């Protein structure tokens, strides 16, 4: 299938520089216009620049013509973009494309700061002893202390889809924190079995606490 | 170099409004503009592009529009699931400006928060530190305020509050509201509670634990 495929997310210390990696697929970048964006945290959409893989001349916003450097090579379609001298200001989702109808890239998260990385201890969310016998009931998972973004909760590992709630976790002190609820009939709980299944990427963690009563 | 100016900054409709979202440049851009539709940690999905020409697959309701400097995105009989953001994108020349960008909130009639506390974790417990957490879901309008009655007394003093953005089917949100303390503290106090003030009932909804 015609698809770009972007590096995975990476924890770089400020100062550094990251080299991101496009990777388009079903067809051949030689003959396209690629170009990035760039994406800060709640923020609005920056363009970074525009490259022609088959000669090289890229074209970029004064702003970023400081840091960022576009270039690709036909090879192997990978388009590439380097990020020199990171600071905090460039903590953000960077974004590939193409100047077609085609889809652009899932995003590669860049995460500039100097937190180690850490993995997040997820916490079981049952009630507290009340007449849950009422239609549906509602548990949760609260996972904190974990850095950096991102994770991913799930419920009976996808079998859970409706009345499934993840906030997007707040930063404190350099960790995060997230939640997730979920609403099953008060039959399902807790004669059937609940319990959340939250992964961690950068921590090659991955965990299951069971949702059992108090 | 061709700036991109947008607005509305926000805006708000229910469903079945005709809606339009404006974008204009400082300078001619010759119908070379392209609309996205940002829903939240989704990657831009390109709408229209060439001014007025809509992506396959994009629903009829979507319409683009616009002549030198002023352009206008229309979404006609608006539906759940065109909240989010949308973006203009100008390429008449580099560098290809953004627009500000438009916040779209789905009119919906009011819900109230169906309210759920639940006391620390079981294990948490022995880390030294409890946070107890209350869930109000599935409400509307976004504004509504909940409080933390440690005992007796009021407390706000640590607490995480963090909203969902709109449903896909309901528009409605949702608020995962956390009291972080440590062990001792919660050890010593009993009815913990979580009190949500929103605009749908005088009185307030009130779920609490007394351990
Ligand atoms: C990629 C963009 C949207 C899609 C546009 C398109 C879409 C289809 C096509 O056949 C040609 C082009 C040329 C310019 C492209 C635009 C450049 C800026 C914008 O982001």
């Known amino acids: 299938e015609v698809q770009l495929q972007q590096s995975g997310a990476e924890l770089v210390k400020p100062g550094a520089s990251v080299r991101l990696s496009c990777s388009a697929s079903?067809?051949?970048?030689?003959?396209?216009?690629m170009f990035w964006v760039k994406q800060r945290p709640e923020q609005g959409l920056d363009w970074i620049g525009r490259?022609?893989?088959?000669?090289?001349?890229?074209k970029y916003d004064p702003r970023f013509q400081g840091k960022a450097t576009l270039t690709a090579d036909t090879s192997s379609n990978t388009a590439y973009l380097q990020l020199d001298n990171l600071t905090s200001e460039d903590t953000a989702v960077y974004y590939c494309?193409?100047?077609?109808?085609?889809?652009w890239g899932q995003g590669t998260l860049v995460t500039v700061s100097v937190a180690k990385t850490t993995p997040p201890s997820v916490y079981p969310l049952a009630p507290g002893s009340a007449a849950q016998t009422n239609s549906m009931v509602t548990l949760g998972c609260l996972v904190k202390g974990y850095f950096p973004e991102p994770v991913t909760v799930t419920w009976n590992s996808g079998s859970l889809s409706s009345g499934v709630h993840t906030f997007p976790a707040v930063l404190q002190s350099d960790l995060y924190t997230l939640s997730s609820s979920v609403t099953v009939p008060s039959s399902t709980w807790p004669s059937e079995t609940v319990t959340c299944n939250v992964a961690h990427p950068a921590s090659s963690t991955k965990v299951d606490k069971k949702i059992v009563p108090r | 170099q061709i700036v991109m100016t947008q607005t509305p900054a926000s805006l708000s409709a229910s469903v079945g409004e005709t809606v339009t979202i404006t974008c204009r440049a400082s300078?001619?851009?010759?119908?070379?503009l392209a609309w996205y539709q940002q829903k939240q940690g989704k990657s831009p999905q390109l709408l229209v592009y060439?001014?007025?020409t809509l992506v396959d697959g994009v629903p009829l309701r979507f319409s683009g529009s616009g002549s030198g400097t002023q352009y206008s995105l229309k979404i006609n009989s608006l539906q759940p699931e065109d909240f989010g953001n949308y973006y203009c994108?100008?390429?008449?020349?580099?560098?290809?400006?953004f627009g500000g960008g438009t916040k779209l909130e789905i009119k919906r009639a009011d819900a109230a928060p169906t309210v759920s506390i639940f006391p620390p974790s079981s294990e948490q417990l022995t880390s030294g530190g409890a946070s107890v957490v209350c869930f109000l879901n599935n409400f509307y309008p976004k504004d509504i305020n909940v409080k933390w009655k440690i005992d007796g007394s009021e407390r706000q003093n640590g607490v995480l509050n963090s909203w969902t953005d709109q449903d896909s089917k309901d528009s409605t949100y949702s608020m995962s509201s956390t009291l972080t303390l440590t062990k001792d503290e919660y050890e010593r106090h009993n009815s913990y509670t979580c009190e949500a003030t929103h605009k749908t009932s005088t009185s307030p909804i009130v779920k609490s634990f007394n351990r």
């Open positions: 300078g001619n851009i010759y119908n070379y």
């Open positions: 494309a193409i100047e077609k109808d085609l889809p």
């Open positions: 079903g067809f051949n970048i030689k003959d396209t216009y």
């Open positions: 994108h100008h390429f008449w020349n580099t560098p290809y400006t």
């Open positions: 060439n001014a007025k």
């Open positions: 490259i022609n893989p088959a000669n090289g001349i890229s």
